[PDB]
Amino acid sequence: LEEIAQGLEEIAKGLKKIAWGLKKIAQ
Amino acid sequence: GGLEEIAQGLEEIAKGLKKIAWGLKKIAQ
Amino acid sequence: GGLEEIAQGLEEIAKGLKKIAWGLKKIAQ
Amino acid sequence: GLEEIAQGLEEIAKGLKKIAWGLKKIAQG
Amino acid sequence: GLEEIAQGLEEIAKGLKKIAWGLKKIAQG
Amino acid sequence: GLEEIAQGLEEIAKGLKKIAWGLKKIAQ
Amino acid sequence: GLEEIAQGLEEIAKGLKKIAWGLKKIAQ
Amino acid sequence: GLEEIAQGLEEIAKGLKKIAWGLKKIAQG
C-alpha cells in the first residue's frame, strides 16, 4: 500500500510536468 | 524545451506505475 | 506538422493511466 | 473503482486517436 | 508505415472503448 | 459484459499487428 | 524518434491488453 | 488477475520510457 501511494504521487508530478511542457509548446 | 519536459513527465509516470505494480504484486503474496 | 497532436494525445493517455491507477487502488482497498 | 478504470481506458482511446491524427499528418508531410 | 501505425492505434482505441463498455456493464451488476 | 471485453481484446491484437507491420515498413 | 514513439505505444497497448485480461479474470 | 495487471503496468512503464527517448530525439532536431 505504501508503494502504491508513492507511485500515485509520482504520477501526479509527471502529469504536471506534461501540462507545463504543452504550454511551452503552445507559446 | 516543452518536448523535453513532457518526456521527463512520462518517465516520472513510468516510475510511478512500476511502484504501483510492485505494490499490487505484494497484494498477490 | 502533427507534433502538437502527439503531445496532446500523450497527455490524454497519461491522464487515463492516472484514472486507471486510482481505480485499481480503490479496488485494492 | 471499476467504472473509473473504464473512463480511463476511454481517455486513453481518445489520446490514441489524437496521436493517430498527428502521425497521419506527418505521413503527408 | 506511419499510416499503418495510425490505423493500428485507431483500432486499439476502439477495442479499448469496447473493453470499457464491458467494465461498466459488470460494474452495474 | 464479458462478450464485449473479449471482442475488444481481439481488436487490440488486430491493431497491434498493424503497428508491427508499419514498424517493419519504416525499418525498410 | 517517431520509431521509438511507435514502439512505446505498441508496448503500452500490450500492457493495457494484459490489464484488461486481468480485470476480466478478476470479475470471473 | 492482480499479477497480470501488475505486469501490464510494468510493460506500460517500459513503453512510456521509449516514448520519452523518441521525444528527446525530436527535441534535438
Numbering used by the authors:
A (entry chain H): 3 to 29
B (entry chain F), C (entry chain G): 1 to 29
D (entry chain E), E (entry chain B), H (entry chain R): 2 to 30
F (entry chain N), G (entry chain I): 2 to 29
Verbatim from the authors:
Computational designs are seeded by the sequences and structures of defined de novo oligomeric barrel-forming peptides, and adjacent helices are connected by loop building. For targets with antiparallel helices, short loops are sufficient. However, targets with parallel helices require longer connectors; namely, an outer layer of helix–turn–helix–turn–helix motifs that are packed onto the barrels.
Some plasticity in assemblies formed from these types of peptides is expected. Thus, it is possible that Ala-Leu-Ile-Ala and Gly-Leu-Ile-Ala can also access an open conformation in solution.
